[PDB]
């Protein structure tokens, strides 16, 4: 597991597309919607299996003659020449959560809080924000609890970090302006119920110069393919979720001028490209031969 | 690359990817301000003035067609717009023109007709109108018939020309 120098690009990792696919199949077997409506319209009505998915971990291990490499440097931005490299038989256990604006029950960056983009400066691109210290989210339907206390300290690390990428600047947490309900709010899967939180409410903070109102919904859009999937209704009165947060998906406005003379950048949550969730766990891993 | 859309109407700008495959794509206006873009399957609206009445067609994306539709078009909406896919910049210029009659309805003889053309900030405007009659009067910036006629009732058509494209407004007439 000797020192060698190679470039890893998480943004072009060939496996995530595979891993993203493997997740789609895991889903076909586990949560089968009663109804899929797709574009004529191709549609089938079936009696549902009603089997919840309770996040079984998956290993994509390197096939025959192909090696999975890991990157050594302690903090690595998404695209970089990596100074030190090890080799591993298998990717580690991966818990696959299909999530938005939040990354769930995941992996934590150890010393520094790291922001990875195919381009960070890119005015357009999804931003991962891999985190050093984690937080707890518990929900009941009803309401969701995020500690009031955790946010002011976390305000600090971010106020400390962003400026360093974007110096002499002022920072906004603002709710998402438009788009679909899954993007608008935090989409996630707990126990065969799909959840949205108007977290528009949560980022209401601006910088330097707390309970979420979740909805339980049985008809939902699919991340998987374009369209709507319908899942049958709930047998029990009350449901428990404990989740831990390891991360974020983010975008900020830019706007490139117009005597706004704005000091500001506004970052709004984000998500919906499933492959990015898959990317935050898998960015270190790479598949090669010889 | 220029197309023209009538005021109050619905217009669509076209975007093409290299292979009939879904690609993350996103949309921008003359300032690098975001209208509409997508995440995989899901859709989102940019913080531009436009966001609502900014919407694109979903069905298309597997082919790799990622259109921008502005509907309930406004004059101020005319802009040069740029769609980004697989690191390509494709651009289209959109201008909005509107025609209007002097007043709402029921105009009778000796009375006079004025059509006015509102053109977006900074553009050339010339007008051709064929009367229901077909006598053709070329107003240019506004068209006036000083005194009105029997011949004149019914629906007649004006043409506005920019970037060598013509757009039709037809005005229904009661005399």
């Amino acid at each position: 597991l000797e020192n060698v120098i190679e470039n890893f690009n998480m943004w072009k990792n060939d496996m995530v597309d595979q891993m993203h696919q493997d997740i789609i199949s895991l889903w076909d077997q586990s949560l089968k919607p009663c109804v899929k409506l797709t574009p004529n319209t191709s549609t089938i009505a079936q009696a549902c299996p009603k089997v919840s998915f309770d996040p079984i971990p998956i290993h994509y291990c390197a096939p025959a003659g192909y090696a999975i490499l890991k990157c050594n440097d302690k903090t690595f931005n998404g695209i970089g020449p990596c100074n030190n490299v090890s080799t591993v038989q298998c990717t580690h256990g991966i818990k696959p959560v299909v999530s938005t604006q939040l990354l769930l029950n995941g992996s934590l960056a150890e010393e520094e809080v790291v922001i990875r983009s195919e381009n960070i400066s890119n005015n357009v691109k999804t931003i991962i924000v891999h985190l050093t210290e984690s937080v707890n989210i518990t929900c009941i339907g009803g309401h969701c609890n995020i500690n009031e206390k955790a946010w002011n300290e976390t305000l600090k690390k971010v106020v400390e970090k962003l400026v360093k990428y974007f110096p002499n600047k002022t920072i906004e947490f603002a709710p998402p302006v438009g788009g679909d309900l899954e993007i608008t709010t935090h989409s996630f899967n707990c126990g065969g119920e799909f959840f949205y939180c108007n977290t528009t409410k949560l980022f209401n903070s601006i910088h330097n110069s707390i309970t979420l109102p979740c909805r339980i919904r049985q008809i939902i859009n699919m991340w998987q393919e374009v369209g709507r999937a319908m899942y049958a209704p709930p047998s029990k009165g009350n449901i428990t979720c404990i989740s831990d947060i390891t991360g974020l998906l983010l975008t900020r406005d830019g706007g490139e001028n117009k005597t706004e003379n704005n000091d500001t950048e506004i970052f709004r949550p984000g998500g919906g490209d499933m492959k990015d969730n898959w990317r935050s766990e898998l960015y270190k891993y790479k598949v090669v031969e010889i | 690359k220029v197309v023209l859309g009538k005021k109050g109407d619905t217009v669509e700008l076209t975007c093409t990817a290299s292979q009939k495959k879904s690609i993350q794509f996103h949309w921008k206006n003359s300032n690098q301000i975001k209208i509409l873009g997508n995440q995989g399957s899901f859709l989102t609206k940019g913080p531009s003035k436009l966001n609502d009445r900014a919407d694109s067609r979903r069905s298309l994306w597997d082919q790799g067609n990622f259109p921008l539709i502005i509907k309930n078009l406004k004059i101020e909406d005319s802009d040069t717009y740029i769609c980004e896919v697989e690191d390509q910049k494709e651009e289209v210029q959109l201008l909005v023109f509107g025609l209007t009659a002097n007043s709402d309805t029921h105009l009778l003889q000796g009375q006079s007709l004025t059509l006015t053309l509102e053109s977006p900030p900074g553009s050339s405007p010339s007008v051709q109108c064929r009367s229901p009659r077909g006598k053709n009067i070329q107003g240019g910036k506004t068209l006036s018939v000083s005194q009105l006629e029997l011949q004149d009732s019914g629906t007649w058509t004006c043409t506005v020309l920019q970037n060598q494209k013509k757009v039709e407004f037809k005005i229904d007439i009661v005399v």
């Epitope: 549609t43 949205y196 319908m230 | 979903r58 069905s59």
Partner: antibody, heavy 125, light 111 residues
Framework: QVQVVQSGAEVRKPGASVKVSCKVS????????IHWVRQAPGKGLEWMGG????????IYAQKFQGRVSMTEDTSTNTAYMELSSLRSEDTAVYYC??????????????????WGQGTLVTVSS | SVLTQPPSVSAAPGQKVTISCSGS????????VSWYQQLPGAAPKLLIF???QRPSGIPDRFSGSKSGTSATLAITGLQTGDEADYYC????????????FGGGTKLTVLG
């Protein structure tokens, strides 16, 4: 053929729920398919509810919010509507509406393509 | 939160006639307009959907248009048979409100 059938006309005492069936022949109801609309005698169309761009809801207009429940069973291929806590004004003709033979991924967008015969409810002292 | 159309309209048996409904960018500018024909004491039928699209079995006499924040229904060769009441439907984005109907108009042809 395509068909819509509504259940027989019915009479109610103020304060009692009413439940009205719909059966659809010629397609399998998507479950996003159906909107319930009723007409007062002598009056124009009033829309009670149906599915909307908010996913969890098949959504009901405000006048009807405390009291009304709408259903489609994708399997029996019929839809049921209950309006409860009845009023003098509620007598009207309740109509079952469906979209079809249209692409409704948009789902937000279908037209009300097939209409039922209409079914009548009158509420009285 | 409400559409308006006229309460009444009339015409000769040869003659063309139109019914116009107007709303707000909150309902109509944003969304599609479809039209419903209601015959004497019968369930309402979809005369028109998606602004200009006529469904099967409607004759070509019927037409539709949309522009600005109002939409227009057009009729030609009007028939004794065409007597009925017409309603304009638009799905609406703002507030809760959902699907909305204008009051509608009763059209009469003079026989």
């Amino acid at each position: 053929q395509v068909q819509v059938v509504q259940s027989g006309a019915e009479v109610r005492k103020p304060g009692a729920s009413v439940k009205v069936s719909c059966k659809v022949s010629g397609f399998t109801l998507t479950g996003l398919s159906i909107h319930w609309v009723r007409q007062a005698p002598g009056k124009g169309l009033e829309w009670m509810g149906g599915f909307g761009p908010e996913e969890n809801e098949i959504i009901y207009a405000q006048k009807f919010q405390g009291r009304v429940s709408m259903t489609e069973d994708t399997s029996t291929n019929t839809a049921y509507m209950e309006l409860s806590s009845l009023r003098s004004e509620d007598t009207a003709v309740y109509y079952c509406a469906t979209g079809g033979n249209y692409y409704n991924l948009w789902t937000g967008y279908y037209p009300l393509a097939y209409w039922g015969q209409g079914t009548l409810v009158t509420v009285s002292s | 939160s409400v559409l308006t159309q006229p309460p009444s309209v009339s015409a000769a048996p040869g003659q063309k006639v139109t019914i116009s409904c107007s709303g707000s960018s909150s309902n109509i500018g944003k969304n599609y307009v479809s039209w419903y024909q209601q015959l004497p004491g019968a369930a309402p039928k979809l005369l028109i959907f998606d602004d200009t699209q006529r469904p099967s079995g409607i004759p070509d006499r019927f037409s539709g248009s949309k522009s600005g924040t109002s939409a227009t229904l057009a009729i030609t060769g009007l028939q004794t048979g065409d007597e009925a009441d017409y309603y304009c439907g638009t799905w609406d984005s703002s507030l809760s409100t959902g699907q909305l109907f204008g009051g509608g108009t009763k059209l009469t042809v003079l026989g």
